[PDB]
């Protein structure tokens, strides 16, 4: 950890984030949902805990 002082919401992505989740993730689950609510989206998320591409490459497999 680095920071953690204080519990607000600020919104149901930020709030998200507070659990270390990624942003793309969050806002896609987030959306993905319907912009519902944490416990909707990170259904979402849980069940996509395993997702296949989250974030697909934007360039290709160039060796490595």
Same mark, same amino acid.
């Given at each position: 950890g680095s920071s953690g002082s204080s519990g607000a919401e600020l919104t149901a992505l930020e709030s998200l984030i507070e659990?270390?989740?990624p942003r793309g993730r969050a806002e896609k689950a987030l959306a993905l949902t319907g912009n519902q609510g944490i416990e909707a989206a990170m259904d979402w998320l849980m069940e996509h805990e +395993? +997702?296949? +591409?989250?974030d697909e490459p934007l360039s290709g497999p160039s060796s490595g």
């Open positions: 659990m270390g989740f +395993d +997702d296949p +591409d989250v």
